[PDB]
Amino acid sequence: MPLDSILVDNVALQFFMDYMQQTGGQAHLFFWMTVEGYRVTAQQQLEVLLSRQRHQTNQTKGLLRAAAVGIYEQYLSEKASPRVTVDDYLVAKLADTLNHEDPTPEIFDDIQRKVYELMLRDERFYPSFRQNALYVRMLAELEHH
Ligand SMILES: [Cl-]
Ligand SMILES: [Cl-]
Ligand SMILES: [Cl-]
Ligand SMILES: [Cl-]
């Protein structure tokens, strides 16, 4: 069962999360999931502010900014626990954008793609997860169909 599907099935995802915790990748996966949540929230909350011209937008904007900043500080920030590592200029670009511009849903998308790539084919994530007992156990929930 492939990573594309693992990440989006909450039964199967648990096994992968466990594996990542054990191998100390958990950070990447969390980052990814947070970004996935974040984007959708931004789209929901900012598409409301278009059809809300016919009124506390500030509340929304500040929340999204906070969320963005939180994501940065937890995961991409230099001074950060595990800290997902990717093309340093992408992170720097993101930081620049944050430091003088209202955030969009997509600010994270470039970094998120790289992180997904890492999770897919870095020998220490998915490819050795599929070589682990946890994978086998997960595929034990064919019994959940
Ligand atoms: Cl489990
Ligand atoms: Cl968390
Ligand atoms: Cl910042
Ligand atoms: Cl972008």
d(CA 31, CA 34): 5
Phi, psi (rounded to 5 degrees) for 63: -65, -45
Secondary structure percentages of the chain, helix, strand, coil, to 5: 65, 0, 35
Amino acid, res. 82: P
Residues with CB under 5 A from ligand 1 (ion): 14
The string of DSSP letters for 71-83 reads HIIIIISSS-SS-
**Which residues, at least 6 apart from 73, have a Cβ–Cβ distance to it below 8 Å?**
80
In the chain, after which residues is the C-to-N distance over 2.5 Å, breaking the chain? 54
Return the number of other C-beta atoms located less than 10 Å from residue 59's C-beta.
9
Give the Å distance between the CA of 122 and the centre of ligand 1: 22
How far is ligand 3, taken at its centre, from the CA of residue 46, in Å?
A: 21
**How many Å apart are CA 62 and CA 58, to the nearest integer?**
6
Domains of the chain plus CATH, in order, are 3-141 (1.10.167.10)
Q: Whole-angstrom Cα distance, residue 118 to residue 139?
A: 23
Cα 101 to middle of ligand 3, angstroms: 11
Rounded distance between C-alpha atoms, residue 66 and residue 89, angstroms = 22
Give the span between the Cα atoms of 95 and 76, in whole angstroms: 9
Which three-class secondary structure state does DSSP give residue 145?
A: coil
CA 95–ligand 1 middle distance (angstroms): 36
E strands, the chain, are none
Sequence-separated (6 or more) residues with CB below 8 Å from residue 39: 105, 106, 108, 109
Give, as one character, the DSSP assignment of residue 125. Answer: S
Contacts with 81 (C-beta within 8 Å, 6 or more apart), sequence order:
27, 74
Q: How was this structure determined?
A: X-ray
- 103 CA distance to ligand 3 centroid (A)? 12
Q: How many residues does the chain have?
A: 145
